[PDB]
Symmetry: C3
Subunit: 270 residues, 3 copies
């Protein structure tokens, strides 16, 4: 095998990125996301309780030692009183766990602040949803920019279209002229139908799905600049090597890796 | 894309019902059921450990307070009595650490206790198993009422049949007459074959599965009166508005939505 | 209810084996492996933390009891001796929280150490990945023994081939004659292409799959003798009812059953 080292290193890195229990959930399935978010919450609060209780167990042992020293010294005073003072100091030190270390709340807004995080909406066609779907990503603090990123993993089709509304004058009236989600979606379906690897039932299902609305499946807001998301999308569309890596394998891994690439970019490989 | 109120809000509510990792496992996959059951076990045991942690924290704080008062007032009868009262209260609080609370678990079993909750058996065809499956639902406290609910998901096919048996006279003998599961399954398969939207290879697998007994994939016991289960089984095959949400989407989403709709009737959406 | 009760018992045993959410992950999707690993880690952590909670709460209870007894007496040796006993028990239990004995070596492996276990690499064909996939099992302490086991569950074929390299003499020179993994893969694909039960588009995908290297999905490992893995693989190939039980059902459950039966020859079936 002539390509079992240079691209195998990147395959190992990609596998490491995909393989986790609280990161990169499946986009088209609320169940996987609900499992992963709860695993995150459980591990987080279990770690919090274990560290808090370890320090409080230290102080409970100190208090027990102080009481035992008092009992063993009564039957002289400073041998127990300084232990009690140290116990008071360490109890005060350990009891402050309300907002001691929550740095990931305010320091994580270095890239984007809260309520400005980009909105990714996940849609899918209603008759071949496992294979064909798309994301509609909306920007904030411009309120007029968005984009559409569509996938058909049955045939390995990737499509990207911006959706920005510009002021236009039709006659002596005005309008917000820019490609709309519905016509971009129908354009994607039309581009998918006239393709040489059509199953002869895949195309019929695409045509049937053309006349009806797509199926909503949720939204995923992440801490990353919208322009960075646009850069990652354009990177996914054109890079042949990224398409070779993230667009091969089991369909579940396909969608997981595609979400990972959209979230991170080219940093997932190497 | 463009739907003002109805379909959008119904799909939203359905997503919130399906956005939890506790309820509505995928019936086809016992691995997901095991994952969800273990997650439930971890949740319950950690809330028990949390209440024990709180009570242990209070008793440790009381002991440390007594020690600190002794240390800072050594160089107390009203304090000795209050310390005993606090210790007795904390011992009473920690006495119920037996976790013997079954009333909240049985609070929904006011009229539907165990061994009376209807059982549901999940079955699947051997060949196109991901798309075609069915439920055999058996009731208790009657031992005569049962039904069959079969979904072929790829073709959008739903079948409901009533397997209630009753006494019958056959010549000078008697029997328990009524529709039975085997012929119900065979008739459902026959109806599935004759749909016009086949695949000329799906039909081959389907008829090949017609000569093999179905595959048992587990049983489920839920806190629902069998009258409600029958009502939901009729509603899922009747209400096309319900089906347009439950029966449309990715397959893994679809089976969970079907189970949820059968469980809560029309409460999954709206 | 079907044909036999022994068959139903075997199926129930298999479903109980796969019922657990902590064992036998899906060999193709690393996300399931990550979720299962985090579940197992959380369960063991909660066991250890529950032990620690019991220890600390009982120690605090004993300390409070001794303090209350001393306070009541002040208003003999029983209070002094029990406090020393509690201190000794607490010290013994806290100092036993290392678990660094050589028993930990057998507490996880218990059969064979590191650099002595076989590793099973998982690959899948690039295009119809969720159906066709193979295991490359390479052992240790021989460095010249290995085997190949491939599955195509769309047309239901399983193939096995050893890749052992024996010393061979050709001319007046020597070579290490065995089987090339690429030859094994390509022969398997040639076997799959010429099956009469063809989809006429699956074959158009297999022929394309021939001329591209497969994707490396990971390398799992279980502490089992390599000869045992060979015997279990040849059991998967050359057994009838094992194939009828493992290779029929939903794809996810099928693959989980395949991995479980590779781990466990017939003990998985019961």
């Amino acid at each position: 095998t002539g390509e079992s080292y240079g691209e195998s290193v990147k395959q190992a890195v990609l596998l490491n990125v995909l393989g986790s229990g609280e990161e990169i959930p499946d986009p088209l399935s609320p169940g996987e996301r609900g499992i992963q978010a709860k695993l995150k919450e459980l591990e987080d609060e279990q770690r919090n309780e274990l560290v808090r209780l370890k320090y409080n167990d230290k102080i409970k042992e100190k208090f027990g030692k102080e009481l035992e020293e008092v009992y063993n010294f009564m039957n002289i005073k400073n041998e127990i009183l300084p232990r009690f003072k140290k116990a008071m100091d360490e109890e005060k030190e350990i009891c402050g766990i309300e907002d001691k270390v929550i740095h990931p709340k305010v320091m994580m807004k270095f890239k984007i602040p809260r309520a400005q995080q980009p909105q990714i909406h996940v849609y899918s066609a209603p008759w071949d949803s496992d294979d064909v779907f798309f994301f509609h990503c909306i920007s904030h603090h411009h309120a007029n920019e968005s984009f559409f990123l569509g996938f058909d993993l049955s045939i390995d089709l990737v499509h990207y279209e911006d959706l920005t509304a510009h002021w236009h004058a039709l006659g002596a009236a005005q309008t917000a002229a820019g490609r709309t989600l519905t016509e971009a979606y129908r354009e994607f379906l039309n581009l998918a139908i006239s393709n040489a690897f059509g199953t002869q039932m895949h195309t019929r299902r695409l045509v049937r799905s053309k006349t009806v609305h797509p199926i909503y499946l949720g939204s995923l807001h992440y801490d990353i600049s919208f322009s960075d998301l646009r850069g990652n999308a354009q990177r996914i569309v054109y890079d042949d090597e990224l398409q070779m890596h993230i667009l091969r394998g089991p369909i579940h891994f396909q969608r997981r890796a595609i979400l990972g690439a959209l979230k991170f970019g080219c940093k997932v490989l190497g």
